[PDB]
């Protein structure tokens, strides 16, 4: 029994993967901003 809507399901899976990647890249940038904060504040301290 073939899938009823193959292409739609594939598109939804790809969208889910891309959403996870976007959420993960956001936290990448977030941690890097934290790293910049850390050295900047430790030099002043």
């Amino acid at each position: 029994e073939s899938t009823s809507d193959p292409l739609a399901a594939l598109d939804d899976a790809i969208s889910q993967i891309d959403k996870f990647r976007s959420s993960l890249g956001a936290v990448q940038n977030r941690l890097d901003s934290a790293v910049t904060n850390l050295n900047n504040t430790t030099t002043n301290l």
């Binding site: 292409l7 598109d11 790809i14 891309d18």
Partner: protein, 50 residues
Amino acid sequence: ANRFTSNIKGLTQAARNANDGISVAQTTEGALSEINNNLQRIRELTVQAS
């Protein structure tokens, strides 16, 4: 960009499929012409038979 790539690959594959379909149609029309020649010959010689 991912969504554009999806459409790009799908459209390339669909174009190849459409080329295969037009090949099918060409083959069928050639067969029909080969039949029609003999059918017209049958008509012509039936006119003589009349």
